[PDB]
Amino acid sequence: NYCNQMMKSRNLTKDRCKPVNTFVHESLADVQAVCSQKNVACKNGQTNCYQSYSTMSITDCRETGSSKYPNCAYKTTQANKHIIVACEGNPYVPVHFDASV
Amino acid sequence: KETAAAKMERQHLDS
């Protein structure tokens, strides 16, 4: 299961089980480029969020109901959607994943 | 240790 292995490999579920996580299958530079695309408000109202002009390939990882540490279990769902990221710093790069429409 | 920009890539990027 891609989700169980990647979450483990990336030090996400090595010391706990994280409910949900999203992996973007695009190039680093192509994702960083989103910080200068469509500006939109973040869920918290903040306006340093940006939406991708086009959809991107993603894999949504969600914990099943039988998941319990130390044996986390995820459900894998692939799809293509716009990603919304919050940007900060210089260079203006993504620091938070806000959502995917 | 790890920056917010680095954390983001490690947690969500799989190019």
Q: CATH no. for residue A93? A: 3.10.130.10
Distance CA A37, CA A18 (A): 30
Q: DSSP class of residue B13? A: B
What is the number of CB-based contacts under 8 A between chain A and chain B?
39
Q: Could you tell me the residue range of the domain that residue A9 belongs to?
A: 1-101
Check CB contact under 8 Å for B14 and A95.
no
Which string of b and e fits A84-101 if b means at least 16 CB within 10 Å?
Answer: bbbbeeeeebbbbbbebe
- Please, which residues 68-97 of chain A have a Cβ atom closer than 8 Å to chain B? 88-89, 93-97
Q: State yes or no: cis peptide before A19, omega within 30 of 0.
A: no
Lateral strand order in the sheet of A20-24: A20-24, A56-63, A74-81
Map residue A11 onto helix, strand or coil: coil
Map residue A2 onto helix, strand or coil: helix
DSSP states of A26-72: S-HHHHHGGGGSEEE--TTS-S-EEE-SS-EEEEEEEE-TT-BTTB-
Please provide residue A32's backbone torsions phi and psi, each rounded to the nearest 5 degrees.
-65, -35
Look at chain A and report how many structural domains it folds into: 1
Q: Which residue of A has its CA nearest to B11?
A: A10
This structure's resolution (Å) is: 2.2
